[PDB]
Amino acid sequence: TLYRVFVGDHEKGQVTAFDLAEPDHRWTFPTTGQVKLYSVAGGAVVAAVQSDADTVQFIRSGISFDIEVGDPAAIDASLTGPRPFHLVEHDGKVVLNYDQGGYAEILDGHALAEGKAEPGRFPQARAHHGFVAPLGGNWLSTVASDEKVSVPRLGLQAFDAEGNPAGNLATCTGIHGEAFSGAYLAAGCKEGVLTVKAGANGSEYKLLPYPADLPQGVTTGTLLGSTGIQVFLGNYGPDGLVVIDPVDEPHYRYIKLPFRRVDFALDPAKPSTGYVLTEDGSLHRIDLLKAEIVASAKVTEPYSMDGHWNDPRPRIAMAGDEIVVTDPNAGLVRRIATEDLSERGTVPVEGKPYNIAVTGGSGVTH
Amino acid sequence: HEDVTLYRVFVGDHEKGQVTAFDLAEPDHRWTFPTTGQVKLYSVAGGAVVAAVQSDADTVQFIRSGISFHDHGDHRDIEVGDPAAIDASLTGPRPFHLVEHDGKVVLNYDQGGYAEILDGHALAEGKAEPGRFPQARAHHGFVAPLGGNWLSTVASDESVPRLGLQAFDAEGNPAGNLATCTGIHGEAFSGAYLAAGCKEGVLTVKAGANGSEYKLLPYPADLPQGVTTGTLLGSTGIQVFLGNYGPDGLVVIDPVDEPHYRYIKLPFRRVDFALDPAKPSTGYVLTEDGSLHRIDLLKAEIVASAKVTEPYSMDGHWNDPRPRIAMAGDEIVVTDPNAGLVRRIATEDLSERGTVPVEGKPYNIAVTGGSGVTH
Amino acid sequence: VTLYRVFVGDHEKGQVTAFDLAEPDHRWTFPTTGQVKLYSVAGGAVVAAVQSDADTVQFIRSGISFHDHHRDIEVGDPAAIDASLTGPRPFHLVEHDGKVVLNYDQGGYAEILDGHALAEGKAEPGRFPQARAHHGFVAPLGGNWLSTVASDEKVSVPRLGLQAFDAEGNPAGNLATCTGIHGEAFSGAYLAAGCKEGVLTVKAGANGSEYKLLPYPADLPQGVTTGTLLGSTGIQVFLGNYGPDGLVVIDPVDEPHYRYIKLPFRRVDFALDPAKPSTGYVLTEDGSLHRIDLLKAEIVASAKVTEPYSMDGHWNDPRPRIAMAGDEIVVTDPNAGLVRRIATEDLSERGTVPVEGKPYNIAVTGGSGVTH
Amino acid sequence: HEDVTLYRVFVGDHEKGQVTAFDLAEPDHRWTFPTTGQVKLYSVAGGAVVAAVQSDADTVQFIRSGISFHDHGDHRDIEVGDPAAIDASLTGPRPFHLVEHDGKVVLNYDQGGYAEILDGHALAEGKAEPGRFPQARAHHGFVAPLGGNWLSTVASDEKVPRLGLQAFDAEGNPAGNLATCTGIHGEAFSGAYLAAGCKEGVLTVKAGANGSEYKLLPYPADLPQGVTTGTLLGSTGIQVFLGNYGPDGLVVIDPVDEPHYRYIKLPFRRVDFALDPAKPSTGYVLTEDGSLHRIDLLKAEIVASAKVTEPYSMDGHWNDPRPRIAMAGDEIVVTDPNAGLVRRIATEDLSERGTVPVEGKPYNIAVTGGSGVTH
Ligand SMILES: [Zn+2]
Ligand SMILES: [Zn+2]
Ligand SMILES: [Zn+2]
Ligand SMILES: [Zn+2]
Ligand SMILES: [Zn+2]
Ligand SMILES: [Zn+2]
Ligand SMILES: [Zn+2]
Ligand SMILES: [Zn+2]
């Protein structure tokens, strides 16, 4: 097996890649600005969205799945536009929201994997901080209000390729955050969590309103979907999580955090578990079956969640039986064992390592 | 539709039986309430009620804020009217420490051997008739609601020495064994925990399935010797306590994991402190040189300081006229008794945004209000 | 029980008089090789009597000891320690981190004693080597030994500054400039020392000694320096002289680092009040004692306690010396043959203690504790 | 007929009484001048003279530039020779702020209770003969020529608060009423206006037929509270001032039209700033992280940034060794005390075009010269 870690800097436009098992096998790729990294097209491509720099660039991992392995390589075709931000990949498509452009860009995943980045433009009625998700042959876009001044958002709506409605608007006030699991897309709302099921008889919309038992005045705005069981992990305020079952009641099981959340991830190698890093520097194992934190260990120094959302703070990603955690002030990436959260080693990375993504896995060569 | 923010500050005098209230952002909107004697002030019932404990004068009076928040509600409604006295007192021998939790306000009568229980919601609707909680003996203690029980301090048989803490029923019948906490003093809630200061360390109790779960956190041998934690604050945002440790120290207390204590050495002796609920990884401590310091609770260190008053030496009596601080959103309000004013300090950078004149020697302070929605 | 025991040296004879403050007829006399400068050491269990002119350092057991099990006090008669140190011109004494360190001005080394061993009656020193003999000091800090360092001028020895060493004199970092370095004290996290350029501060750091010079502000009187420092034990602040007729309250952390106090006459002696750490006391050459508010950096009360003792002439002429004993200041009065007791509360004279000779240097041991 | 450009930079040491001069484009053409103490440098008399005010050393000395320009109908001719000390010096108790206007150079003696008035032309021909302007009381102030009057700051009596600004004749006889400007500090000219910083806002004055015309620009309520403008630059292009507003803010101040204020939040605290006379509305500000930022004065925003020095925290005393900046045509020159150099930064793109080594810890800076004609 081969995991290749891709680490961004907090300030410089730079992506560092290294083989997890031999960090001396390393590469550097230049970018226009600060990167937020996404493993896409099955891990054959890393997308480096640079919101502040109106740019999106791509890097070949280049691990393709049998597994074929070569050195990573930049894709020179890039993308430019006004504040690309949220990236959604589903049904073989990568979709990029341009927050200050009022449109999204649709890329074919296979085409990216062969080094081509020629997008089709999806029009939106108004520019805003949104996303566009492929589902059931439609493009499900967030929809802003026409009310003037940060743009208020009304909900989610299915559209065709030309940006004409393919279904009615589903109310989801302030819609934010999205994930897929099983047959379901989920998105965070002021009223609860909106689910859409790609079903045999078409798309099924159902809002799951927040139960009265949940803390008041706070919402789910960030979602992860398990790849193994049909369940979502969402935040619920800065100091809580909800395990969300989209099918049966009760839809929500709340988990109280003792410090505020810095980042989290679900373990694709152990689909009934995830990890959450909190501002005291502790990484916690989440048992999705029990809906509780079941183990913790301090892995970084504290990083207060007070201040600005994009300040330098640790980011996490999964790589096999390890969690990789960037530590910007320490200039390094820490490797934590999923088995018992022991520290297996560190990897020096120059500068302030910030965002992170992982590609690869286990395969056959013959 | 407007988000409305409105903080109303309540200031007691060091000598006069007087509470001054004013709108923080509009200090000419102000009111004065007479009291029997020197007040110690507490915001209770979500800020709908200010309790004015007057220990030396054996009474507690209440003032309606009257800023109240109500859940419509996909959100929070704010209702604003003039403050107004509640005519109904509580009366007794030297009430002192006040505890609010699980919707109850509880007052300890140091010279009476009982505490009085008031319902928070009933106070906010203007009623102050308490239910009595009997104690085996009079002492300087407290009674805290927890897990359906009443956790009271307990005196010895011999200032009255105190043995520890114990869970009781409403009639004062024991609901569990005494938890040793010698000289028990100071208390606060954070996350799942009640904490109280002891001679041996800090006692924690959490509501458990078989009742309250007690655990003593012993003071490490590293800590300066001969001094203890006797005053505690609990964060409402994260699960952590801040206590003093001697006159010139603080401890950040983690109730869960080791290390339970992280010591912060203050450069001058402590006058007052407060935690910032709007920025829960931070607090503020005022020291006797007149400096206000921002506390990083996560790293347990002082991270910024500025001189905000003239010095107020900690030599002399604990109740001499000295500043008191309270939080009001993105400001700390600091009373300055000798100057006749309350100072407004920005939490962002510790700059002084302005001052508010208050007659006399403004002493104790409490804050009501916040942010909400109208219609 | 509270018990303060005063130790008074003579200006000429090698003699220390000890007496219980509350009953001065409970007294003892100890001979010494020569004129003493007295230091309360090992928490008050031991008095060190440095005799610079006589190449000797002798010790006297207090003997008041506190067994911080609140705190227990044990009281017995004071007693000489028979083991003494001898060497060329011992002078400045520093106590910190359980170590008492003596600088031999004409020996080019210092002697390190363990405070605990002294309190149990043993005086076996270790030798700290220096590059060159000079009037300096050696201070423990963060596992290192911060020694003053002389120049190679020829040949009073000019001094370059302060430098960290290990116990054998191997350098642990570069020398920090502090020209004519003189005076030292600890308060809070800081060591401070006086320089021509200002006051050098040093903190124990993760990677070793962390130096920071505070240069004298231009608003301060010119041509004069801080050469004598006291450090508070209850707050983090230093009191230094600044010239013969000024004081500076020194904040090692924030600006302003210096706050000047003009004295009405030149300074004879000063001390900080450990029982009231925001206050100190300064005696001026007119014979007045002044209370210093360290927080406000000002004199807040004055009273005449002795006849004048001009600061003209030699620095070691017979002059009053002061020390704290609970709620009193004790003031030697060499010409009157007395120790005067001054109440800190209101600076009135609570009494006198007649002593043989010309009482000069003074130190206080004891305090308050519990008995059973 | 030849267009010649030649800038001559003058740099003071932070410690030594020393001014270094060098031709910007050929730094090996350089000169050194001794002074009594630490200098603050001012280009005066069209750049023919550098004034070296030494506040701590109770001295002011002058250096002939000596690059001078001479009007020539269509254009200016440039005259170039070596610089040279002016032998006449001035002494007095703490000379500090210097104002030049209407051909007069005026120096405020902070601890003397007067200012000295010098004629620019006499200075340019090498004479330092001051005229006396008396003040009611010594203070940290300034005296500005305007409309035939002398506008002096005015202190209180007491025993120092400053009350405002007042117009006088040359004898110190009041020519108008006191204009309130509490704590008045900082001044600049732009167009018809003198401006000065106040606790209440920014005071502006224009020369009118009935004497000085005052109008205070009160700080808008939207601005951060409790902080002030105390340092002002006057634009030669649009008619606007650039002031600080707190340690980490700027305001573009329009004395004629609303909005009178446009606020700029700096990412770190301000070290120094300057306006670019080659452009109608561009300035430069150096912040404590070592970044130089280009300010668009009409949009009131930072439009470009680059790191130019190591960090120099604004913690500590204002007069500690820190970079200072000045304009030289299409470059900014930045002193770098720790690096021992002056850095040349291109205004077009903020790149480092070169450095010039200077002895010691280069601190304050002034620039003389420019573009002119030779025949
Ligand atoms: Zn195969
Ligand atoms: Zn977002
Ligand atoms: Zn509502
Ligand atoms: Zn109490
Ligand atoms: Zn005992
Ligand atoms: Zn000496
Ligand atoms: Zn010409
Ligand atoms: Zn000034």
User: What DSSP line would sit under C158-200, residue for residue?
Assistant: -EEEEEEE-TTS-B-SPPEE-TT-EEEEEETTEEEEE-SSEEE
* Cβ distance of B280 and A306 shorter than 8 Å: yes
* Tokens read off for A26: 């390393």
Classified as helix, coil or strand, C119 is: helix
Q: What's the rounded Cα separation, in Å, for the pair B243 and B208? A: 24
Are residues A74 and A59 in contact, defined by beta-carbon separation less than 8 angstroms? Answer: yes
B140 labelled ligand-binding: yes
**Residues counted in chain B:** 375
Euclidean distance between CA atoms B234 and B202, whole angstroms: 13
Tokens 């020529």 — which residue?
Answer: D145
Cα gap D330→D333, rounded to integer Å:
10
Residue D294: how many CA atoms within 13 Å on its side-chain side?
A: 18
Annotated binding site of A: 66, 86, 129, 176, 366
Residues of D in contact with B352 (CB under 8 A): 226
How far is ligand 3, taken at its centre, from the CA of residue A147, in Å? 19
Tokens encoding A2: 């081969």
Task: Closest CB to C71: pick one of B226, B267, B314.
Answer: B226
* Residue A51: both structure tokens together: 């919101």
Maximal CA-CA distance, chain B: 63
Whole-number Cα distances in Å, B222 to A195, B195, B218, C205, C345: 54, 21, 11, 18, 35
- Say which residues have a Cβ less than 8 Å from residue A198's Cβ, sequence separation at least 6: A135, A136, A183, A184, A185
Contacts of A279 in chain B (CB under 8 A): 238, 281, 298
Q: Which other chains touch chain B, taking contact as 3+ CB pairs less than 8 Å apart? A: A, C, D
**Number of residues that this document lists for chain D:** 375
| Separation between Cα atoms, residue B67 and residue B77, nearest integer Å | 10
Q: Give the C-alpha separation, A284 to A302, whole Å.
A: 14
Q: C255 and D56: CB-CB below 8 Å?
A: no
The total domain count for chain D is 1
Q: What is the DSSP string of D316-339?
A: S-TTSS---EEEETTEEEEEETTT
B190: nearest CA partner in chain A: A258
D185 is in an annotated binding site: yes
- Residue B47 · residue B64 · CB < 8 Å: no
CA of A9 to the centre of ligand 2 (A): 20
How many CA within 13 A on the CB side of residue A277?
27
For chains B and C, count residue pairs whose Cβ atoms are closer than 8 Å: 43
Q: Which residue has the tokens 């200041």?
A: C329
Sheet holding D104-109, edge to edge: D95-101, D104-109, D114-119, D131-134
Q: Which ligand is nearest to the CA of A49?
A: 2
Distance (angstroms) between ligand 5 centre and the Cα of C75 equals 14
Between CA A93 and CA A105 the distance in angstroms is: 10
CB contact under 8 A, A260 and B239: no
Residue A14 CA to residue C296 CA, distance in Å, equals 54
Cβ pair C279:B305 closer than 8 A: no
Chain D: nearest CA to C332, how far in angstroms?
39
C-alpha D251 to ligand 3 mean position (Å): 38
Judging contacts by C-beta atoms under 8 Å, the chain B residues touching residue D246 are: 351
Sheet holding A252-256, edge to edge: A223-225, A232-235, A240-244, A252-256
What is the distance between the alpha carbons of residues B310 and B290, in angstroms, rounded to a whole number?
A: 5
Resolution (angstroms) equals 2.2
Strand partners, A208: A193
Contacts (Cβ under 8 Å, ≥6 apart) of A274? A224, A233, A264, A265, A266, A267, A285, A286, A288
How much is the CA Rg of chain C, to the nearest whole Å? 20
In order, the DSSP letters of D197-265 are E-SSEEEEEEEETTEEEEEEEEPPTTSPTT-----EEE-SSSS-EEEE-STTEEEEE-SSSS--EEEEE
Measured between its terminal Cα atoms, the distance across chain B in Å is 6
**Residue C290 in marked binding region:** no
The structure was resolved experimentally with: X-ray
The tokens of D42 are what? Answer: 């001012």
B235 contact residues in A (CB cutoff 8 A): none
Mutate to test the interface with B, among C259, C278, C279 (most CBs of B within 10 A): C278
CB contact under 8 A, C295 and B268: yes
**Single-letter residue type at A189:** C
Q: How many CB atoms lie within 10 A of CB B287?
A: 24
Any binding-site annotation on B293? no
CB contact under 8 Å between C217 and D317, yes or no, is yes
Chains near D (3 or more Cβ pairs under 8 Å) = B, C
Minimal C-alpha gap between C208 and chain B (Å): 20
| Mutation for testing the D interface, residue in C251, C253, C255 having most D CBs under 10 Å | C255
Cβ–Cβ below 8 Å for B279 and A306:
yes
The alpha carbon of C239 is separated from its chain's Cα centroid by a whole number of angstroms, namely 12
Q: Which amino acid is located at C45 in the chain?
A: A
Of C71, C254, C296, the CB nearest to B311: C296
Question: Residue C172: left (phi > 0), alpha (psi -120 to 50), or beta?
Answer: alpha
* Bridge partners of residue C75, in order along the sequence: C64
Ligand nearest to the CA of B230: 4
Q: Which amino acid is at C313?
A: G
The SS3 of residue C209 is: strand
Say how far residue D165 (Cα) sits from the centre of its chain: 19
Q: Which residue of C has its CA nearest to B313?
A: C278
Ligand-binding annotation for B317, yes or no, is no
Backbone angles phi, psi at B322, to 5 degrees: -145, 155
Cβ–Cβ gap D56/C218 under 8 Å: yes
Contacts of C256 in chain D (CB under 8 A): 317
Q: For residues A322 and D345, what is the distance between their CA atoms, to the nearest angstrom?
A: 48
C-alpha span between C5 and D226 (Å, rounded)? 55
Within chain D, how many helices (H) and strands (E) appear? Answer: 1, 35
Full DSSP string of C327-341: TEEEEEEGGGTEEEE
Angle at A136 between CA A135 and CA A138, to 5 degrees: 70
Do the Cβ atoms of A56 and A96 come closer than 8 Å?
A: yes
With CA atoms as reference, report the closest residue to B63 among B38, B95, B91, B35. Answer: B35
* CA dist., res. B254 & res. B259, Å (int): 7
CA–CA separation, A351 and B198 (whole Å): 46
Q: Which ligand is nearest to the CA of A178?
A: 2
Q: Are D102 and D117 in contact (CB under 8 A)?
A: no
In whole angstroms, give the CA distance from residue B31 to residue D325.
Answer: 53
CB B53 within 8 A of CB B38: no
Nearest to C212 by CA among C254, C167, C261: C254
CB D139 within 8 A of CB D110: yes
The range of the structural domain enclosing residue D44 comes to: 1-375
Please return the burial class of A70, using the count of CB atoms within 10 Å of its CB with bins 0-12, 13-18 and 19+.
exposed
Question: Which of C189, C276, C295 is nearest residue B311 as measured by Cβ atoms?
Answer: C295
Contacts of C293 in chain B (CB under 8 A): 313
